[PDB]
Design a protein around this ligand. Structure first.
Ligand SMILES: [Ca+2]
Ligand SMILES: [Ca+2]
Ligand SMILES: [Ca+2]
Lengths: 49, 49
């Protein structure tokens, strides 16, 4: 007696939470400790991490 | 839902404090002590430091 509207459903959800990367900074204080940078000087400074 | 502005930062500082050199002067009083410089005289005067 009923004319069914033939439509059933399925569903799902997608969760995009974080950003791809975290650029953790540990800044450099390049004259350093137990060192010295003078005017006109020339050299190299290294920070591994 | 958010469109991230994808920019992270890193930083560091450089410390140029001193001038390259210190010209310590210890002046000379060349007629010296226990010596004598006369008019028209000729000679040599030495200061090691
Ligand atoms: Ca993050
Ligand atoms: Ca140098
Ligand atoms: Ca100085």
């Amino acid at each position: 007696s009923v004319t069914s509207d033939r439509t059933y459903y399925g569903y799902g959800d997608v969760s995009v939470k974080n950003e791809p990367v975290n650029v953790v900074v540990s800044p450099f204080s390049f004259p350093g400790a137990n060192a010295s940078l003078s005017s006109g000087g020339q050299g190299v400074f290294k920070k591994p991490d």
